[PDB]
RNA sequence: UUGACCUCAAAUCAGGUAGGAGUACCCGCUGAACUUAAGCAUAUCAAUAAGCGGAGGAAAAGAAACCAACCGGGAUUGCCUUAGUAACGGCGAGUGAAGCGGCAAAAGCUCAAAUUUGAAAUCUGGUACCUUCGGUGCCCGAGUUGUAAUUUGGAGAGGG
RNA sequence: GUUCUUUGUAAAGUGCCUUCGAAGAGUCGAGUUGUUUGGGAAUGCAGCUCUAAGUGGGUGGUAAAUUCCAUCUAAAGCUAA
RNA sequence: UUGACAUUGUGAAG
């Protein structure tokens, strides 16, 4: 991660004596805690499953995991959120 | 505390328990007047994070507003202009339905100040909102340091000028290159960019 | 309208309340641990660790929920009349998870009158005097058999679906002929 | 309206521009007002220097990174290294910027030195209220100017290894261009 | 029978508050056409005039879900500049910002989300008195479906 | 500048060790329609439909899959020149 | 005017 010392190339830039700043607590905003993990687990067993989540579970058992992502992408937004949702449904299926 | 559980449970809007509650409550709201006083918040957890406190001087109102687009109110659809302005049906109001509900409650109680509002329910015809209002004349508010800023005359009819949370979003009051048109006010920015500046010793 | 529709099990569990005989004994024990009134507060303050350790009923939704999560509540009373039902709808599951016995009792106004409030919506006992240990254990066994031990089966049962008086007669008539 | 050999003009005057003409007739008047405001603020506020001490920072961008200028405020780490707290620093006339970070040791050392010199050249009056009269210096920036750091000595010896600088630039440029394609070939094999 | 609670009403009930005017400047909504393109419909005029709602001595914005790609900068506003530039456009007529750099002015902050639980510690009103932009005692009421103290990410909290 | 009250077994700041560290939902985001912008596989705003996550989320000015990196901390609020 | 989605739940058969 050191600079080469010249104005062009991969690690272009001037060499200076590096320092490590203290980590900022705001960088851990999305970090799970013991309190919030307990609440979310308790709510899931109370509320149950959404109608589109039930259809996703059926597709995993009957039509494979690949088609579940295609449907999950349509109900959700981006493709990255569909992958996370499918993995969440797999854990629910596994713990049964 | 129970507020943490309420926050997470409110996010499961399509669960069986919340579907039952939303069907019963939407019927009850439809039977009441379009604007009516609410005895207590329906979502106490949501009210607290928007600034509500359970003390004298805080008032909750419930309001019902019609959904859909804004039909251009011209007779028989005639616009009398160029074809680019002949649209009538597919036009959209530039302010949200939440703002419309907030403004109408403000006129009903002109002695109060609107703090915030939140969504509660909706059907095909209507959306339902609850509005938080503060009494600027009550001594429990005027003697409280955290809330007596609302008593300043500069904060009269905040919802009419779009100074509330929903008003600032519709105005595009945000930072970054995405909001270059409306960072400091769209019309103020336009005036600055369309002004001819001349000095005594011409440049 | 709330009884014509099918009630989900999470809400339907609140239709079962403590019976009159055991509820009367429940309030008899709780009435021995009333919080001190403002008048009793004044005499205590002017006398003042010159005071003995107090024993009183714990109340307050945020206060009681924290007590359950820390394994400190020995018995929790739940009102069935909370109009924003979400405030208390999760308590039976939370108590079941933490192993704290609970009872759905009839009347938020009645819970309030034992804590000098108009309404309370929740009450709990954390520490009881030695002379009342036997009474508390007898109540817990009776209360557990009605709510805690039946939680698994109640969670699977839907409520509601009751027809009106005239609709019931019409259906019964068609079934007979 | 096009004739003769003339440049193409782009004068933007097709709106109601005459309604939005701003002539600065009050340029001299505003200078008098600003000087009056500075004079009345200096007398009103304190024998304080009318401005806060600022740190020295590196200007961003490859076009301006060769110069140092005044930043907004000293970092939390910089004020801690000087032996004071952020809350107390603000009341003594030191600007504190909590969102700036330290990654350069040279900049960090320079800002620490500035804080040391500032504390040695000021007198903090006690809160009792004695407040002996002192001469008011109107500019802390003038008292503590910012200087460009030295880079090299005036003359040295010629140390040539025979390698061409032009060749070095070409090879470094070529290495970056083909880095991705070469890695793919190695991965495939 | 009696007494609570919840919700909903009434009173020339006790005390308050809103309307209208002004509107140069300020915050929003709504919204043209003449005109230009040598015709004309997209475009342009213009996110303008007219219409409607709402403030102040300023308003608004404001302490980053920012800019950057640098050895990084560091709330907002304004001036000089960037620049008639990147870009948009029957790519026609025309339109058109932003980062950096210099300067003016500089100022920072707090709620929600935690059990005071060996003590609702909080507050409106009434009444008596007083050193009256308020204070004290007392009495009802609000409030546990949460009023104070404590902590707002730069952190911070429980123990030693 | 002088003077009357001790506020207070009050309040605040600073070192080291250990366990923790709660952070805003019909919202973000996505599709579509209209309007708007210099913003161009779509700059902002709004209607309808769908509707999240917690080592997460937004942004990095050409759509997409995959692998990294940088940078901030939205959906709550006040504030002179 | 026609279709789709939302409003939109409950039970049975072909
Ligand atoms: Cl808030
Ligand atoms: Mg940060
Ligand atoms: Mg009266
Ligand atoms: Mg404006
Ligand atoms: Mg023409
Ligand atoms: Mg002509
Ligand atoms: Mg013509
Ligand atoms: Mg006008
Ligand atoms: Mg005035
Ligand atoms: Mg001014
Ligand atoms: Mg202001
Ligand atoms: Mg911040
Ligand atoms: Mg800035
Ligand atoms: Mg234009
Ligand atoms: Mg428009
Ligand atoms: Mg890119
Ligand atoms: Mg594109
Ligand atoms: Mg503001």
CATH number of the domain within which C131 lies? 3.30.1330.30
Looking at the partner chain, which of C65, C89, C90 has a beta carbon nearest the beta carbon of B1? C65
From C153, B197, B168, select the one nearest D20 (Cα to Cα): B197
Strand order in the sheet with C75-79: C102-105, C75-79, C122-125
Closest residue, chain A, to D101 (C-alpha): A21
Smallest Cα distance from A25 to chain C, Å = 26
Distance C63 CA to E160 C1' (A): 28
The nucleotide minimizing the C1' distance to residue B95's CA is F46
SS3 helix, strand, coil % of chain C, rounded to 5? 50, 10, 40
Q: Quote the number of domains for chain C.
A: 1
Q: Does at least one atom of strand G sit less than 7 Å from the CB of B45?
A: no
Length of chain C: 177
In angstroms, this model's resolution equals: 2.2
Measured in angstroms, what separates residue D133's CA from nucleotide F1's C1'? Answer: 14
How many whole angstroms separate alpha carbon C148 and alpha carbon C95? 9
Quick check: do D and A touch, 3+ CB pairs under 8 A? yes
> Residues 100-129 of B near strand G (Cβ < 7 Å)?
123-125
Overall size of chain A counted in residues: 96
Distance from CA of A18 to the nearest CA of B (A): 30
Name D15's bridge partners.
Answer: none
Please report the DSSP string for chain B in residue order: --HHHHHHHTT-TTSHHHHHHHHHHHHHHHHS-SEEEESS-S-HHHHHHTT--SSTTEEEEEEEEE-S------GGG---S-GGG---SS---SS-HHHHHHHHHHHHTTTSEEEEEEEEEE-SSEEEEEEEEE-SSSHHHHT-TTTGGGGSGGGTTTTTTT-SHHHHHHTT---SGGGTTTTT-HHHHHHHHT-EEE-SS--
Q: Which residues from B are below 8 Å from A51, CB to CB? A: 14
CA C136 to chain centre: 15
Proximity of residue B94 CB to strand G below 7 A: no
Strand order in the sheet with B58-66: B35-38, B58-66, B126-134, B113-122
Nearest residue on chain B to A35, alpha-carbon basis:
B4
Sequential DSSP letters for C130-170 = GGGHHHHHHHHHHHHHHTTTTHHHHTT--EE-PPPHHHHHH
Ramachandran sector of residue C76 (left: φ over 0; alpha: ψ -120 to 50; beta: rest): beta
How far apart are the CA of B151 and the centre of ligand 3, in A? 25
Domain range enclosing C97: 1-164
- Nearest CA among C103, C86, C112 for reference residue C150: C103
Instruction: Name all contacts of C134-138 with Cβ < 8 Å and 24+ positions apart.
Output: C135/C29, C136/C29, C136/C74, C136/C75
3-state secondary structure of A32: coil
Any idea which ligand is nearest the CA of D1?
6
Q: CA B135 to CA B140: how far, in whole Å?
A: 9
Residues of B in contact with D25 (CB under 8 A): 200
Eight-state DSSP code of residue C54? P
Answer yes or no: are the C-beta atoms of D149 and D106 closer than 8 Å: yes
Chain D residues touching residue A4 (CB < 8 angstroms): 172
User: Which of C1, C7, C87 minimises the CB distance to B2?
Assistant: C87
Whole-number Å distance between alpha carbons of A38 and A21? 33
Evaluate if the CB of B18 falls below 7 Å from strand G. no
**Domains, chain B, ordered by start:** 1-203 (3.40.1120.10)
Question: What CA–CA distance (Å, rounded) separates D66 from D61?
Answer: 9
Q: What residues of chain C have any CB closer than 8 angstroms to a CB in chain A?
A: 10, 69, 89-90, 93-94, 97
Q: Which residues of D touch B191 (CB under 8 A)?
A: 20
Task: Tell whether C47 is covered by a domain.
Answer: yes
Nearest nt (C1') from C6 Cα? G10
Partnered with residue C102 across adjacent β-strands are: C76
Give yes or no for a contact between B117 and B104, defined as CB atoms under 8 angstroms apart: no
C167 strand G contact, CB < 7 Å: no
Structural domains in chain A, CATH included, are 16-96 (1.10.10.1760)
Distance between CA atoms of residues C59 and C122, nearest Å:
6
- B110–chain D Cβ distance below 8 A for any pair: no
Spatial contact of B146 and B139, defined as CB atoms under 8 Å apart: no
Tokens of C6: 């099918």
For residue C159, list its beta bridge partners.
C7
Contacts of B20 in chain C (CB under 8 A): 5-8, 11
A43 with B14: Cβ contact below 8 A: no
Burial class (CB in 10 A: 0-12, 13-18, 19+), C105: buried
Which residues fall within 8 angstroms of residue D131, CB to CB, at 6 or more apart?
D125
Q: What is the dihedral of CA D122, D128, D132, D138, to 10 degrees?
A: 40
Please tell me the distance between residue A28's alpha carbon and the centre of ligand 2 in angstroms: 9
Chains C and D share 3 or more Cβ pairs within 8 Å: no
Say how far apart CA B114 and CA B129 lie, in whole Å. Answer: 13
Report DSSP letters for B32-91, one per residue: S-SEEEESS-S-HHHHHHTT--SSTTEEEEEEEEE-S------GGG---S-GGG---SS-
Would you call D22 helix, strand, or coil by DSSP? Answer: strand
- Residue D83, SS3 per DSSP: coil
Nucleotide nearest C41, from its CA to each C1'? E119
Using DSSP bridges, classify how beta strands B126-134 and B58-66 pair: parallel, antiparallel or unpaired. Answer: antiparallel
CB atoms within 10 A of CB B176: 7
Give the C-alpha separation, C164 to C148, whole Å. Answer: 32
Residue of A nearest to C8 (CA): A47
The Cα D129–Cα D109 span in angstroms is 36
What is the Å distance from ligand 10's center to D34 Cα?
13
CA dist., res. B4 & res. B24, Å (int): 24
Q: Do B9 and A43 touch (CB under 8 A)?
A: yes
State the Cα–Cα distance between residues C55 and C126, nearest whole angstrom: 9
User: How many Å from the CA of C154 to C1' of F55?
Assistant: 39
Find the nucleotide nearest A28 (Cα to C1′): F55
CA dihedral C84, C85, C86, C91 (to 10 degrees): 140
Q: Report the residue count for chain B.
A: 203
Instruction: List CB contacts (< 8 A) between B196 and chain D.
Output: 17, 20-22
List the beta bridge partners of residue C124: C58, C76
Looking at beta carbons, which residues of chain B come within 8 Å of C5? 20, 23-24
Closest Cα in chain B to D24 = B199
Q: Do A22 and D106 touch (CB under 8 A)?
A: no
Residue pointed to by tokens 């007590």: C67
Q: Give distance in angstroms: CA of B56 to centre of ligand 3.
A: 20
Flag whether C99 is in a domain: yes
D22 bridge partner residues: B197
Residue D44: its H or E element: helix D27-45
Residue with tokens 């979003």: B169
Between strands C75-79 and B35-38, the pairing is unpaired
Q: Do C37 and C29 contact (CB within 8 A), yes or no?
A: no
CA of B177 to the centre of ligand 16 (A): 15
Helix (H) or strand (E) holding A91: helix A79-94
Task: List CB contacts of A14: < 8 A, sequence separation 6 or more.
Answer: A3, A5
List C-alpha distances in Å: C77 to A39, B61, C118.
21, 32, 16
Question: From the CA of B147, how many Å to the C1' of E127?
Answer: 29
C137 within a domain of the structure (yes/no): yes
- Nearest by CB to residue B2, choosing from C6, C10, C61, is C61
Beta partners for B114?
Answer: B133
CA-CA distance, C74 to C138, in Å (whole number)?
Answer: 13
């Amino acid at each position: 991660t050191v600079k080469t010392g010249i104005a062009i190339g991969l690690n272009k830039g001037k060499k200076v004596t590096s320092m490590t700043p203290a980590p900022k607590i705001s960088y851990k905003k999305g970090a799970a805690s013991n309190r919030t993990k307990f609440v979310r687990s308790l709510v899931r067993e109370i509320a149950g499953l959404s109608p589109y989540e039930r259809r996703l579970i059926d597709l995993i058992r009957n039509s494979g995991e690949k088609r579940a992502r295609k449907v999950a992408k349509k109900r959700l937004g981006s493709f990255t959120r569909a992958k996370a949702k499918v993995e969440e449904m797999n854990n629910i299926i596994a713990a049964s | 505390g129970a507020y943490k559980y309420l926050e997470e449970l409110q996010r499961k809007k399509q669960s069986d328990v919340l579907r039952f509650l939303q069907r019963v409550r939407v019927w009850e709201y439809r039977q009441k007047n379009v604007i009516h006083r609410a005895a207590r918040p329906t979502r106490p957890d949501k009210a607290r994070r928007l600034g509500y406190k359970a003390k004298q001087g805080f008032v909750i109102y419930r309001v019902r507003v019609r959904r859909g687009n804004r039909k251009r109110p011209v007779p028989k659809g005639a616009t009398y202009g160029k074809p680019t302005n002949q649209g009538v049906n597919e036009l959209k109001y530039q302010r949200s339905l939440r703002a419309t509900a907030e403004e109408r409650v403000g006129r009903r109680a002109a002695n109060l100040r609107v703090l915030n509002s939140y969504w509660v329910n909706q059907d095909s015809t209507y959306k339902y909102f609850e509005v938080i209002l503060v009494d600027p004349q009550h001594k429990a508010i005027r003697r409280d340091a955290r809330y007596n800023w609302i008593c300043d005359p500069v904060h009269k009819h905040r919802e009419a000028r779009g100074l509330t949370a929903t008003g600032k979003k519709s105005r595009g009051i945000n930072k970054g290159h995405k909001f270059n048109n409306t960072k400091a006010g769209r019309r103020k920015t336009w005036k600055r960019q369309n002004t001819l500046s001349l000095w005594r010793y011409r440049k | 309208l709330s009884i014509r529709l099918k009630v989900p099990p999470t809400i339907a569990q609140f239709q079962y309340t403590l019976d009159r005989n055991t509820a009367a004994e429940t309030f008899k024990l709780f009435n021995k641990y009333r919080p001190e009134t403002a008048a009793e507060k004044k005499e205590r303050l002017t006398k003042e660790d010159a005071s003995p350790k107090p024993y009183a009923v714990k109340y307050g939704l945020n206060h009681v929920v924290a007590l359950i999560e820390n394994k400190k509540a020995k018995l929790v009373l739940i009102a069935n009349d909370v109009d924003p039902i979400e405030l208390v709808v999760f308590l039976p599951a939370l108590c079941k998870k933490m192993g704290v016995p609970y009872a759905i009792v009839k009347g938020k106004a009645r819970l309030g009158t034992l804590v000098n409030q108009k309404t309370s919506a929740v009450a709990a006992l954390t520490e009881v005097r030695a002379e009342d240990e036997a009474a508390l254990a007898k109540l817990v066994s009776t209360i557990d058999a009605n709510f805690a031990d039946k939680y698994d089966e109640v969670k699977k049962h839907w409520g509601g679906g009751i027809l009106g008086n005239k609709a019931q007669a019409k259906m019964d008539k068609r079934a007979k002929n | 309206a096009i004739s003769k050999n003339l440049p193409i003009l782009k004068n933007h005057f097709r709106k109601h521009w005459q309604e939005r003409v701003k002539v600065h007739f009050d340029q001299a008047g505003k200078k008098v007002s600003r000087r009056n405001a500075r004079a009345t603020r200096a007398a009103k506020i304190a024998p304080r220097p009318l401005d806060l001490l600022r740190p020295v920072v590196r200007a961003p961008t490859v076009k301006y990174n060769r110069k140092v200028r005044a930043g907004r405020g000293f970092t939390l780490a910089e004020v801690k290294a000087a032996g004071l707290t952020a809350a107390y620093a603000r009341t003594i006339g030191i600007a504190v910027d909590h969102r700036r970070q330290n990654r350069n040791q040279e900049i960090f050392d320079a800002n620490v030195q500035r804080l040391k010199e500032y504390q040695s050249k000021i007198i903090v009056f006690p809160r009792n209220g004695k407040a002996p009269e002192a001469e008011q210096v109107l500019s802390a920036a003038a008292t503590f100017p910012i200087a460009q750091p030295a880079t090299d000595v005036e003359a040295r010896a010629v140390q040539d290894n025979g390698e061409s600088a032009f060749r070095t630039l070409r090879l470094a440029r070529s290495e970056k261009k083909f880095r991705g394609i070469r890695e793919k070939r190695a991965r495939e094999k």
